Design a binder for this molecule. Structure first.
Ligand SMILES: Nc1ncnc2c1ncn2[C@@H]1O[C@H](COP(=O)(O)OP(=O)(O)O)[C@@H](O)[C@H]1O
Lengths: 97, 291, 290, 330, 322, 49, 319, 48
């Protein structure tokens, strides 16, 4: 659900580990839509981390996950593995895709 | 209950049918007919005649399965432990979940729900059953025969009345969702009010109004709606026939409106009662004002 | 009504009409979505206050005995068994159910328990509304005059009815014969003369209303086109479920083409303004709908 | 009807034609989203907006709190994928009716065209439908309007021509989807995200090859890099068929080449049998958008390289459907 | 007059007396320099606390008014009375814009959430209800109290509401999820009044109690609860422990609150006195013979150096602070 | 509903709150707690033994 | 402060079934008390104009009513030869003093709040104890019906106006008429003295010279049926200024709470507010369709109320 | 003093088991729930 995805994303951001989420379309459509928000926040935090004006001596880049400020490591990434050919699997919302 | 009722042949037959089942052990009713046809009122009247206590669950928006379970516990405690004859009148609209149907199926078929009483409730039920057995004169100490006596008392005392509208697909679905609803229940098809019933209701209600016209000319092609209308009809009979035709006209209008794809609201006997009441009131008011 | 009414009005005018009729009786507006609906219902039942309840699609089955009038008379009291407690039902109690969804489905028992009152928009009413709107927008003096004349005709007809009723009452109430007491003659002469000037006012207001009708005949085709356009808009739901358009949408389109029209900045001729209004009405209706 | 061939002007409609009490329902066919449009609109109108993705109970909580704050503070609220909660949509519609928000308040409900959306909510708000643009001209106009002017007009003067070529390629690829068996093998999701990725690739590689120089030679442009990337990752990622990939490669080698900068380059050939589409000779954004606006109204599948009869059955079917629709609601 | 140290002084400024019945509660207008007092004569009189001049009376309640409160903007006034009704007043036009029913008995407290979109109230039917400001609909019913709930007060951010009841316990609820966060039961008699600790006093409370600094950085919300056993107790909501007990009132405590500077505790009781407590040393500094009878409530202005105390002698007094 | 109760020599100790008028005002006007139920007392009530 | 009633009215309070004789303001509460000729005293709320209750203990027409400093008691007099003390918390008569023969005209309570003074047709003024109810000392010297009696701000000086053309000021201690004034053209009917807020305002209005102590001394005001209002000096007894311009008989006079204007009513059916320092504000305000009987000025609130014979009590805003 | 007043409701059918139940209720409230109770009872309530 949304809470489990948020906690896993917090763990990945803090560790700096790659998250491969196989069968990502097995989630509910509403849960995928909700998870899109966390994914977008993480991606924006990563994007603002990459600009040249950022300095490591300043405050670390953080993102809003589960109503908390969590540090985002530049090394982490989110990958989803899917097979859209199976009937009954959820359809990902456009904002998530 | 202070609500006026007009009596015709079908009402007498229906109350006789209901009274027959209420005098039998483990007698459950399955009344099927349009809403507002008097199913609940007739059931309550017959239950009052036979001394039964009418129990209806007070469902609301927040009603859930636990409330249904507590109502079932209350009615079973009253029926079995207190040896109270209870007519459990329950409507289809009171079923908000399939668990309701499961509990009802078990109760109609076996007479007891195995998992309804547990923990403190089970102990309270057992103490009450011991008290009831002592009152009846039986000596029971262990829990098993106490529960058997409670089940027997519930079977002998509790009667369940089911009222629902005649939906073909709904009836077919209920034939599988609640098998005991069609095996442990006597199905009575009240249906809608027939042409004869409507004609009798019109004649009885409009008896007080004058509706007399000695110089009334009978048309050569009388639009006969009620089959048993007298061949030389009077003015009152013609008026009641016109009322019945009006009701059938609304039925046909909704049929056509549903055929074209529109949204229709079902006509019930309550519509006919409102129509005759409005007719009487308007007749009296217009006569008084004109005079 | 015999059964308590259920009002269907998407525009919300019927709700305000009901609140205005029963304002003197201290009507209370509540809803089924309110958690404390039971308390308001019980207070209305006990004190006999009119009640208007919205969001009937969330109907609470607690109202079933109230709608069915399942009362128990005992010792001069009228008892209604709302839930598990007995309540003295005051005879002045009345409840109105309202909803804003014309497409909502109701269970058959609810349909049996209430008297459906549907407030649907008609072609004649829409034509009259659009004609009044265009008269107000383009000829404000004519619109003000028409409103004043309608008020005066209402007052004059009220006065004529009151005078006729009073004359009949006076002729009925004589304890004897007319010329025995001169006050009767005074009253009859006064009533007849008052009827005289009120009638003369009726003819003068009638001729002014006649000229008002003549000046307003030019805008009738615009109102007819407005009605046709809106009823084409309403029937667009037959080809796709997404084409749901309310009356307020067409009213907004009409207001935009009347008051917020950029092509009426420098045009002063009434015929030219009307033609521009019609053309831009069609254009804006297509632009917003499509 | 010429107003609907132009890109939608959300700024004016939101500013004037939409009341604060009326939610802005923005329905979209699958493959299109209106979230980016509203985010851009808020960015250009320097208006703070709260975006919430519907689908969780705490999501509904944040939606309620954001609406309650914005009706008083005059901010904007986005609720995406609201079609997943029809009952909550009905509750929100009931809440919105009894509300007197700030004059600058706006509520945007981003949903797809689903039959489960409540009718009362549809009547309450103003609907905007987002879908594939009707024509190649309209698609290229939308592409040029979406891309900021300052982004196109950078130091290299050849960037405008590259953007025009990319817009034409996107229009050709996206319009071939209307003919599912002929234009492609299946309904691929060629959308705005692919266009943005391609534009970012163009910018990155042009900046890499051109170290801030005002002009670059047409042959020094990394044609191979852009072609390979747009054939492998950007547009070829969604393609799962070898012949669809071959068609995409053919289009890429036809469009993205050094010959595209010639005056006599042909975007399309024998569209009507005699006339062919000619590459504009302009070097700035303004000339290209004027050329796009000057495209003829008549359009045929030969513009996309397809046979001219590929739309005959489709046009006949649409005519029959139009007749049936007119007859159904007489 | 140190900007965060003034305490009230025994020379009173004004003694406003217009009420025909005992004054129930007194509050300050957050924005305007205006003061509002509620009494048992079903009237809500409005006074100016600079010049001590009566302005107007807000009538409409049938029975005694028990509590009044303002929203953050001061544009709305919510009042609850003994006639089971809660009225919302448009303070600009001074008219009752909404009357809310639903409580089954006397309503003894009311408060507007910090967000301003909800109203929380406590009544004698042992329930706490939440009402929408816009619609007036009841949306929640916090049950669990075994007796008459006397007070309800939200915290600074509005996520928690505390309540005290005749069941001799103080309960802290969570607004979002309706659960009872903690049940503070150490008073030996009925609890009258409660008050939350402002953020400006968190460090002072932590250093006075000797509480070690938490690694989270938030000391945790602190709550006070005056009760009829003549004692005031400071609680830690996060842990549920009583930090200190303040002793020294000679009768039932009717009101308690912090100084806006978060250095002192102001409390009034039925011993006819208004007391200033130094919770740093857990002792009482100054005692003011406020009124000639029981003191029902007090308020402390956020910025201006002024204290107002209502009383059963039908007199509302304003105290200059020096 | 004025009530007359005969056979007072078998007095039932349930009228004690009624006979003592142990009512409380406010929150429903006159409230009488006959046993465990908070009954609302009607001002027109009168009982003769 | 500079409050002045305006021609528009707020409420027209009509509950009496007999002409209203006097209207007063409650010292602390937002309560108006009106005494009429139907032997009833009615209580109103001047802020919202709602009838509150009636005090129907009196037998004959009620003439004059008066509160104390605390407003905790209401003393009333009537034509039934008795004085009734009303307990304003329970609104019940608690002490009915008898004697003081024939129609009692006026009643007043000194700021001490322990003794009461009353006037009647029997050409004498009696002194009562609120605690016990015994007439301990009887004042004599008036040769005709005494109409109105008013004490000072500290319960020591009393003046009484009578049909005998005399306005004579009296002392509690030695029971002697220190000042006797017989100079009005016709019968004097209404009197009211000066609050301490207006002692300084008289000096520049009349040019009076301060004595050795420096205090201007107590002042006197008396309206007489000769359509003239005249303001006097208690210490000396000489005229300071005569106010002329009332069309018909004057019925009640008093000073503005700010002590700057003169506000009085008369049988001229109009309420007239006058300036005495500069003779500037000569506003005439129609108040009632019939004769106007009494009036009062709120100490702090900007409200004035007038009682008339037309069965009505009216409330005016002050601006 | 904050004590909760408890009075047993006797009637014609009030017997020993009812008094035992009332005593159990009072003892449970005053020993398990730490509730101070002032158990007021009259000699007329002593039926046995
Ligand atoms: N025979 C009858 N005569 C008059 N009214 C009737 C009769 N039967 C039913 N009604 C009306 O129907 C209402 C009760 O309907 P009910 O029996 O609850 O419907 P259902 O049969 O669907 O349960 C009553 O208010 C009554 O006025």
């Amino acid at each position: 659900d949304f809470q489990a995805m948020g906690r896993i994303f917090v763990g990945l951001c803090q560790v700096g580990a790659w998250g491969c989420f196989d069968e990502f379309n097995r989630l509910e459509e509403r849960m995928l839509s909700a998870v899109s928000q966390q994914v977008q926040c993480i991606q924006e935090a990563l994007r603002e981390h990459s600009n040249p004006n950022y300095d490591k001596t300043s405050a670390p880049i953080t993102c809003e996950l589960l109503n908390k400020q969590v540090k985002v490591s530049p090394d982490m990434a989110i990958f989803i593995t899917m097979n859209p050919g199976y009937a009954g699997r959820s359809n990902l919302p456009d904002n998530l895709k | 209950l202070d609500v006026p009722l007009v009596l015709f042949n079908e009402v007498l037959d229906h109350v006789l049918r209901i009274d027959r089942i209420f005098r039998q052990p483990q007698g459950h009713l399955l009344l099927i007919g349009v809403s507002g046809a008097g199913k609940t009122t007739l059931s309550r009247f017959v239950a009052w005649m036979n001394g039964l206590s009418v129990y209806q669950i007070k469902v609301h928006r927040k009603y859930t399965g636990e409330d249904f379970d507590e109502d079932l516990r209350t009615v079973l405690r009253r029926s079995g432990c207190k040896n109270e004859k209870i007519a459990f009148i329950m409507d289809e609209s009171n079923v908000l979940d399939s668990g309701f149907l499961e509990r009802m199926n078990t109760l109609l078929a076996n007479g007891e729900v195995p998992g309804l009483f547990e923990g403190d409730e089970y102990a309270t039920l057992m103490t009450q059953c011991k008290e009831g057995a002592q009152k009846e004169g039986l000596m029971l100490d262990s829990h098993e025969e106490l529960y058997k006596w409670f089940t027997s008392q519930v079977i002998r005392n509790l009667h369940v009345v089911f009222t629902m509208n005649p939906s073909s697909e709904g009836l077919k679905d209920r034939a599988a969702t609640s098998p005991a609803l069609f095996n442990r229940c006597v199905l009575n098809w009240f249906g809608d009010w027939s042409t004869e019933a409507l004609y009798q209701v019109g004649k009885e209600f409009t008896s007080k109004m004058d509706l007399e016209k000695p110089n009334y000319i009978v048309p050569d092609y009388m639009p006969v709606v009620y089959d048993k209308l007298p061949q030389p009809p009077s003015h009152r009979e013609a008026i009641v026939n016109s009322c019945v035709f009006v009701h059938q006209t609304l039925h046909q209008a909704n049929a056509r409106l549903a055929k074209r794809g529109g949204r229709t609201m079902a006509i019930t006997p309550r519509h006919y009662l409102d129509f005759i009441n409005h007719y009487a009131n308007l007749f009296h008011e217009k006569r008084s004002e004109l005079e | 009504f015999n059964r308590y009414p259920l009002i269907i009005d998407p525009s919300g005018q019927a709700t305000e009409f009901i609140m205005n009729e029963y304002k003197d009786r201290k009507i209370t507006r509540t809803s089924f979505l309110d958690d404390a609906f039971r308390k308001n219902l019980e207070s209305a039942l006990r004190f006999g206050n009119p009640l208007l309840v919205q969001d009937v699609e969330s109907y609470d089955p607690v109202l079933n005995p109230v709608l069915n009038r399942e009362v128990r008379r005992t010792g001069g009291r009228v008892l209604i068994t709302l839930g598990d407690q007995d309540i003295d039902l005051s005879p002045s109690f009345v409840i109105f159910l309202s909803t804003r969804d014309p497409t909502v489905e109701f269970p058959p028992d609810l349909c049996s328990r209430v008297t459906f009152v549907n407030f649907t928009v008609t072609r004649s009413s829409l034509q009259s509304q659009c004609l009044n709107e265009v008269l107000k927008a383009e000829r404000p003096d004519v619109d003000e005059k028409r409103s004043d004349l309608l008020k005066l005709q209402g007052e004059f007809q009220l006065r004529l009815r009151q005078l006729e009723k009073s004359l009949l009452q006076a002729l009925n109430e004589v304890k004897g014969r007319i010329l025995d007491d001169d006050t009767i003659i005074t009253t009859l002469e006064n009533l007849k003369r008052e009827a005289a000037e009120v009638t003369r006012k009726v003819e003068e207001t009638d001729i002014v209303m006649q000229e008002v009708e003549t000046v307003s005949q030019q805008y009738l085709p615009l109102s007819t086109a407005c009605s046709s356009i809106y009823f084409t808009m309403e029937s667009l739901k037959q080809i796709h479920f997404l084409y749901q358009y309310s009356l307020q949408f067409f009213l907004d389109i009409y207001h935009n083409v009347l008051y917020e029209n950029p092509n009426l900045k420098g045009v002063t001729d009434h015929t030219q303004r009307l033609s521009i209004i019609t053309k831009d009405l069609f254009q804006v209706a297509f632009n917003r709908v499509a | 009807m010429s107003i609907m061939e132009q890109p939608l002007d959300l700024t004016h409609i939101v500013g004037t034609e939409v009341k604060p009490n009326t939610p802005v329902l923005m329905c979209s066919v699958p493959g299109y989203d209106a979230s980016g449009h509203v985010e851009d609109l808020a960015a250009e109108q320097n208006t703070q907006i709260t975006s919430i993705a519907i689908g969780s109970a705490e999501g509904f909580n944040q939606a309620d709190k954001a609406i309650n704050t914005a009706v008083k503070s005059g901010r904007w609220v986005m609720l995406k994928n609201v079609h997943l909660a029809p009952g909550w949509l009905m509750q929100l519609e009931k809440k919105l009716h009894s509300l007197q928000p700030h004059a600058c308040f706006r509520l945007f409900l981003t949903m797809e065209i689903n039959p489960k959306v409540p009718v009362n909510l549809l009547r309450a708000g103003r609907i905007f439908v987002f879908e594939p643009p009707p024509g190649v001209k309209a698609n290229m106009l939308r592409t040029f309007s979406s891309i900021p002017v300052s982004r196109i007009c950078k130091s290299p003067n050849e960037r405008a021509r590259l953007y025009f070529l990319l817009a034409w390629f996107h229009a050709i690829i996206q319009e071939r989807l209307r003919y599912a068996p002929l234009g492609w093998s299946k309904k691929y999701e060629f959308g705005e995200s692919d266009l943005r990725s391609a534009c970012d690739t163009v910018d990155t590689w042009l900046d890499d090859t051109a170290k801030g120089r005002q002009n670059i030679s047409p042959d020094k442009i990394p044609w191979s890099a852009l072609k390979t990337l747009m054939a492998q990752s950007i547009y070829g990622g969604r393609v799962d068929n070898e012949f669809d990939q071959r068609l995409l490669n053919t289009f890429l080698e036809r469009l993205f080449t050094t010959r595209s900068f010639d005056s006599e380059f042909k975007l399309a050939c024998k569209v009507d049998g005699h006339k062919d589409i000619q590459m504009p000779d302009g070097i700035r954004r303004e000339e290209f958008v004027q050329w796009v606006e000057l495209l003829p109204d008549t359009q045929t599948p030969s513009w996309l390289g397809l046979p001219n009869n590929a739309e005959r059955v489709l046009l006949t079917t649409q005519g029959v459907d139009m007749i049936s629709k007119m007859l159904k609601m007489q | 007059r140190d900007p965060k140290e003034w305490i009230p002084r025994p020379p009173e400024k004004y003694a406003l007396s217009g009420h025909r019945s005992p004054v129930t509660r007194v509050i300050f207008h957050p924005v305007f320099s205006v003061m509002v007092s509620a009494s048992e004569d079903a009237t809500i009189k409005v006074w100016d606390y600079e010049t001590g001049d009566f302005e107007r009376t807000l009538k409409g309640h049938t029975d005694s008014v028990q509590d009044i409160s303002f929203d953050h903007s001061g544009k709305l006034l919510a009042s609850c009375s003994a006639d089971m009704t809660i009225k919302l007043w448009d303070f600009q036009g001074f008219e009752c814009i909404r009357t809310m029913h639903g409580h089954d008995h006397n309503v003894s407290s009311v408060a507007i959430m910090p967000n301003g979109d909800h109203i929380v109230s406590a009544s004698r039917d042992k329930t706490i209800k939440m009402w929408e400001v816009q619609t007036g609909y009841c949306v929640k019913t916090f049950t669990g109290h075994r007796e008459w709930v006397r007070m309800v007060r939200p915290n600074q951010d509005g996520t928690l509401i505390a309540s005290c009841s005749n069941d001799q316990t103080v309960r802290v609820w969570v607004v979002a999820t309706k659960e009872c966060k903690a049940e503070l039961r150490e008073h030996e008699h009925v609890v009258e009044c409660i008050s939350w600790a402002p953020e400006s006093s968190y460090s002072s409370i932590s250093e006075a109690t000797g509480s070690e600094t938490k690694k989270s950085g938030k000391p945790g919300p602190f709550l006070l609860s005056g009760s009829r056993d003549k004692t005031i107790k400071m609680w830690d909501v996060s842990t549920g422990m009583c930090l200190m007990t303040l002793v020294g009132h000679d009768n039932w405590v009717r009101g308690v609150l912090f100084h806006s500077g978060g250095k002192f505790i102001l409390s009034c009781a039925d011993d006819k006195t208004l007391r200033v407590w130094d919770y740093k040393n857990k002792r009482c500094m100054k005692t003011l013979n406020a009124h000639e009878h029981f003191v029902t409530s007090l308020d402390f202005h956020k910025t201006a150096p002024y204290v107002v105390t209502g009383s059963v002698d039908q007199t509302v007094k304003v105290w200059e602070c020096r």
